[PDB]
Amino acid sequence: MNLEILDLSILGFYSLISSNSFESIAILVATIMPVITELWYNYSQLFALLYTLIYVGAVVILFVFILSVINEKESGLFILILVLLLDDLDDNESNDNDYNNVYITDYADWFNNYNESDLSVIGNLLFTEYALLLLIISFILLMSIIGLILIVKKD
Amino acid sequence: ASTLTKEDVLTRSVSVLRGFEVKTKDIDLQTTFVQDLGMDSLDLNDALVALEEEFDVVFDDKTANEIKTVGEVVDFVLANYLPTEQSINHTIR
Amino acid sequence: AIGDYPVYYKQPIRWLSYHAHTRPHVFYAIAVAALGPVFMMATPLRRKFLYDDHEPLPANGYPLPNRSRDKTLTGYDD
Amino acid sequence: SSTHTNDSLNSSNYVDKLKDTHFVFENDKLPSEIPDVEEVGATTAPLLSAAYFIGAKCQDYNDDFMLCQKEAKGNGPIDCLKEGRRVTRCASGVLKDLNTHCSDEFRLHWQCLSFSNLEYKNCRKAESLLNKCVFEKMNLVKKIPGIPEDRQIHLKQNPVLKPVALHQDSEVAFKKAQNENSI
Amino acid sequence: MIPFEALIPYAIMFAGFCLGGGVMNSAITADITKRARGPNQEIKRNVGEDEGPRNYTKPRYNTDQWDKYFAVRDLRLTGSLRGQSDNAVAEESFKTNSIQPYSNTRRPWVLRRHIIMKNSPTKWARKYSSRRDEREQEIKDDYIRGMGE
Amino acid sequence: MLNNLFDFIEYIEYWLIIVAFVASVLIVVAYLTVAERKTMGYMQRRLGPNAVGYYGVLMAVADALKLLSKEIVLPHNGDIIYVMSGPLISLFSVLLSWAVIPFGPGLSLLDSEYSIIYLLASGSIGVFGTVIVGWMSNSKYTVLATVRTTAQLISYELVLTTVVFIIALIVSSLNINVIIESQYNIWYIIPFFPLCLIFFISALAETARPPFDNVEAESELVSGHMTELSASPFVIFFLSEYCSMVLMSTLTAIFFFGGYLPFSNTIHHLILNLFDQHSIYYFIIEGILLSGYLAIKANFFMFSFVWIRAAAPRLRYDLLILFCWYVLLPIVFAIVVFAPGILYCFDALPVII
Amino acid sequence: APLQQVGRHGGPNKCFGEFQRVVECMTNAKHDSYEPCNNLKNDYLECRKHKVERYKAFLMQKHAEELGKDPEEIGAPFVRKRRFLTSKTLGLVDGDDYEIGVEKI
Amino acid sequence: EESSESALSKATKWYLLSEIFRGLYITLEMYFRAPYTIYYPFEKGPVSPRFRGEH
Amino acid sequence: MDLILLMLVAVGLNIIDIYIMIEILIMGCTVNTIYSASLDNDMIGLIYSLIQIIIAGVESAIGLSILVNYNRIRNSEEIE
Ligand SMILES: CCCCCCCCCCCCCCCCCC(=O)OC[C@H](COP(=O)(O)OCCN)OC(=O)CCCCCCCCCCCCCCCCC
C-alpha cells in the first residue's frame, strides 16, 4: 500500500482546480515534498537534503516574496474526476516489461577500505577532475549578480 | 483599442435617456437636453452622470456649462474612450 | 589637504588609512581574507624550518607488493 | 558514509518497502569438488582488536590472495579460491591462539572497543596490556607501515585525543599490572 | 544577592535535558547489550548464574559502509546486528545463511505520476513509442536464437 | 501473564524512548517562557510570575490551557486551513530539527554524515512556514510584516549557513557527533570567537527575537504577524518561536562550546568513578552528566537570549539588511578562506576518523 | 581521458571494468574496423541494466507455469520483513522466532 | 584625519561590541539587587493622613 | 492520456504560473538523473544533478527579476 500514490493523486487534483497564484505556489511546494521524501528513502539521501536547502530555502521563499508584489485579485466535479481516473490507468513511464517486473541484486565488496560519503567523492571530482565546470558555474553566477541589478535597478 | 463607434454610443444613449423623465421619447443627435427634455440643473446632472457610468468617460468642469445638445455627448465619448489597463495576467499568457 | 580623498597612485599609505577610518567593514574584511593566501604562500618556509610533511594516507586499496607471486609458498593447505 | 545500495540492509523498513526488497536465502552449499573450509566466526569487535595480529601472522598469505586477484584479470572469485582458504585458515589460527594464550587480555581489549564505539583511540590502556602479552607468547609485533618507528600512534605517551569516558576494567587491569609487572 | 526564585525555572530546564539524556543513554545501552547476550529470548532475559560481570555496549555513531556489512555479518553469526562472538570457527549455519537483498529498479513514483513532471519529449517516446523497444527486443531475442546454431 | 508482558515492553520500549525524548524538549521549551519573565524580571527589578503554581512554576501550563480553550477566529465556517498552516509548518520544522541533536555519544534519533545539511534544511522550511502567516488573510498588519519578515530571515540565513559550514570545514565532517567529539582538546569559542558572535547575531535574527524584532514590532505592528492569530494558532506558533530559542541556544553550545563535553575531565572521571560499570545505574548517571553538561551550556545562551532582550533597543529594519550584506557577509566570507589557508600552511588538513 | 562510472567511494564501480575494455578495443591500432568490439559493447550495457539477464528470468518464470511447477518448491526462499530475520530462520541452532533488533544499531 | 583614536582602536570597539557588552554588564548588576515589588493584598503601599478616598 | 496535452489544463493562468511549470519540468530531469546515477553507482551523474540544481536556480532568479521589472513598469508612473 504505497501511500506515495495517494498524495500525488491529491496534487493531480488541486493542480486542475487551481484558480489564483496562491494555489500555483502551493503546487510547487506540494511537488517538492513528494520529491524530497521519495528521495530520502529509496535512492539518494544526500540529494533529498540538497533539494530542501536550495529549492525551498532559496527559490520557493523567493517565489512568495515576489508574488506578494504582483497581484491579489478574485466543467464541474465529474469531469475532473473522470480526467484523473483515465489518466491514472497507465503509470509505467517505461515499456520494458522484463526490466520492470524482475528484481536484481548487487554483491558487496570489501576492497574500498577507505569508505567515504558520496559528497566527498563529488568534491574530489568537481574540484579536481572537472574544475572547469565549477569555474564556469562561478562565472554564470557572476553574470546573474550583474544581470539581476541591471534589469531591476531603475537608475 | 477603442471599440465604440458613433452608432454604438447613440443606440445605448437612448436607453439611459428612456430611464429618466423626458418630455418626448424621440431623442436623436439633434435633440437638445434642457429644451427638448425640459431638464433643469439637478435633473440634467443625473443623466450626464448616468452616461458617465455606462460609457465610462468623465466630463470635466469646462464642458459643464457648455453642454446644450445630446449629439455632443455622443460624439464626446468617442474622442474620450480608452480601455482600462489590464494586469499582467490578462494581457500576456 | 585637510580632509582630501587620497590618490591611490600618489599616496598609497594615506589611501589605505582613508578606507581604514571611514569604511571599517571593507578594510578589515580584506585584511582577514588576505592572510589566507599570505599564509598559504609561506608554506615553503615551514617545510624546511619547522617540520616536514606527513606521508600520504594509504587510500588506494590494499597495498599490493611490487613483485611476482611466490611459487614456493606452502602450508595451511587442505 | 551511509548511502542506500542494493547489496546490504538499508536505513529503514520504509526504504525496503519502496524498493520492494526481498531478502533471499540460498539453501545449497558449495559443490562437492570445491574443498570445504571452516569460516572465521568472529564479529566486529574481536577482529578490530586482532586486525594487526592477524596481519603479522598472515602477511605472506594476505599478499598472495590479493596478488592472485590481480593476476586473475577479473576472474578472481573462481581463480583464487584455493588461495582464499589459506587466508581463512591462518586467520583462524590467530583467533584460536589469542583464545588459549592471551584470552584475558584479548577480551579486555575488544570489550573496551565495544564500549567506546570501536575507535582505536579510546582503548590505549587495554591495548598496551594486549601488545605486551602477545609479544611474550606469539612474537607478533604491531606495526603501522610507512612512518618511522618512533612516530607510530599507539606509542605516543601523551595523545591529544583521549576518550571522554574511561573504561573501568581497562583502568583496573592497567593499575593491577602497573606495579606488579612494571615495577 | 543571588535570587534563588529566578533560578527555579532553570533547574527544571536542567532536568529537562537530563530526562532525555538519562533515559536515552540508559535505555539504548540496556537494550543493545541485552540483544547481544544470545540468539534467543530465553537467554536474553535470564540472568546467568555461571556468567561473569555484565559488559555493556554503547551505541555506535559515525558509521561507514563497512559497518553495514559488519552488522549483517554479525546478524548471520549471532542473531543480532551487534552480537559478540570471538570463536575461531563459525557455526555450520553461517556457511549457508547469507542474505542477499533483491529489489526493483523503477523510477520514483513522483517522476511517473505527477500531472506535469512526467511530460517531456523523451519521456513520451519511452511511454508511447515502440522504436526504443523494438531494437532492444532484438538483443533479448538473439540470446535464444544463438544457442543451438 | 509475565511472558506476554516482558516481551510486550520489548515491542514498545523504543516508542517510550521517543516519548521520553519528546517530553524532555517540551519541558525545556515550556519553562523557557517562565524563565524569560523571571530573568527579565529581576533584571528590571521586577519579580516575574511567582503566583501561578508554587513559586510560579505552573505558569506556562496556565497560558497553554488558557489559550487552547478560546474561540478561534475564522474567515468562514470551515476555513481552518488558513489559520493553521502557518503555525503547523513552523512547529514541525523546528520539531524535526531535534532529530539530530545528540545528547551524548551517538544519543541522537538521526545519525548521518549529513546532519548539518538536514539541520539547515529543516531551518529553511520553518522560514517558509512563517511567510505563510502573513498571506492572504486580509491585509492589515500580517501582510505588512511578510515582505519585511521574508527579506530578513532570508538574508541572515546566508550568514548563519556560512558560519555552520566554516565549523564543518575545520572538522571536514557534516556529522554533529563528529563536530562535538572533535572539540576535545579545544573549544571553537577560543579560535572562532568572531564566529560565535556572528552565529548568535544570526541566531537572534532568524528567530526574530529582539533586538532584531521588527517582525512583531509591537510599537509599530501591534502584535506583528500574530495579530490575527488567537487561541490554538497562537499556541502552535508561539511554541514554534521558543523551540528555536532552545535549539539555537543548544546549537551554539554544540558548535562553539563543545556540546555535551565536560567542563573538566578530572571532575568528570571522579563522579563516574563511584558507580560500578556493570550495573545500569552507571549509565543513568552518565547520561545525566553529559546531558547536564550540554544543558548548562545551553542554559547560558537561553539566559543570553533574555539577557540581550533586556539591555538592547530594537534595530531599525533598513539597517538590518545593510548590516548582514555589507558587514557580516564579507567577514564570514573571509574566515571561510582564512581557515583553509592556516590549516594547509602547517599541513593540518582535517580528516574524518 | 575523463573518468566515467566512478563508484560511491571514489574508485571504479561495478561496470567500469567492462567500460574500459570497450575503450581499449575501440582505440587500439590493430583493428581495421569496430566489428571486433561489438560483443564488448553488448556486455557493458548488460552490466548496467541486465536486460538480457532479466529476459532469461522472464522465460524461467513463464516456463515454470506450463509444466505445473510451483514457485514454492523451485524458488529461492526469502524473507520480506527486515525485523523478522529471526535466528530460527537464520539457522542458528538455539535460535527462536522472536523479532530481531533493527530499531537502533 | 583629525580623530584621536586610531583606525585600529575604533575598529576594535566597533567590531567587538564594546558598548553593548558594557550595557549588558550593567543590566546584570541589577539582577543581583533586591526587587522593589511588594505583595498585594498581603501588604499595602504607604498612605498619608491626607489621602482622599471613600467619602 | 498525455498525447492529448493534458498538462496544459494543470497550468495556472498567470505568468508566474508558467515559471512554476518550467521549474517542475526541470526538476523532473534531475530526479531522473539521480535515479540513473544511483543505480549505476556513478558519481559522475550526481555531479550532473548538482549542476542542474545550481543552473536551474540561476534561471529562476533571472526570470523573476525580469518579471518584477516588467510588473514595476505598469505601476511605474511615480507622480508623487
Ligand atoms: C501540513 C499540511 C497542511 C496542509 C494544508 C492544506 C491542506 C489542503 C490540501 C493541500 C495539499 C494538496 C496538494 C496541493 C497543494 C495545495 C494546492 C491547493 O489548491 O490547496 C487548496 C487549499 C484548500 O482550499 P480548497 O477549498 O480545497 O480549494 C479552493 C480554495 N479556494 O487552499 C490553499 O490554497 C492552501 C492554503 C495554505 C497553503 C500552505 C502551503 C501549502 C501547503 C504546504 C504544506 C503541505 C505539503 C503538501 C502536502 C500534501 C502533498 C500531496
Ligand SMILES: CCCCCCCCCCCCCCCCCC(=O)OC[C@H](COP(=O)(O)OCCN)OC(=O)CCCCCCCCCCCCCCCCC
Ligand atoms: C488504455 C490505453 C491508453 C493509451 C493512452 C493513449 C491513448 C491513445 C491516445 C491517442 C494515440 C494516438 C497516438 C498513438 C501512439 C503514437 C503513434 C505510434 O506510436 O504508433 C502506434 C500506431 C500504430 O503503430 P504500428 O503500425 O502498430 O507500429 C508497429 C511497428 N512495428 O500509430 C498510429 O497509426 C496512430 C495513428 C496516428 C496517425 C494519425 C494522427 C496523426 C495526425 C494528427 C496529429 C495531431 C496534430 C499533430 C501535429 C504535429 C505538430 C507538428
Ligand SMILES: CCCCCCCCCCCC(=O)OC[C@H](COP(=O)(O)OCC[N+](C)(C)C)OC(=O)CCCCCCCCCCC
Ligand atoms: C575581524 C573582526 C571579527 C568580528 C566579528 C563580530 C562582528 C559583529 C558585528 C560588528 C559590527 C557592528 O556591530 O556594527 C554595528 C552595525 C552597523 O553600524 P553602521 O551602520 O556602520 O553604523 C556605525 C557607524 N560608525 C562606524 C561611525 C560607528 O549596527 C549595529 O549597531 C548592530 C548591532 C548588533 C547587536 C547584536 C547584539 C548581539 C549580542 C550577542 C552577545 C550577547
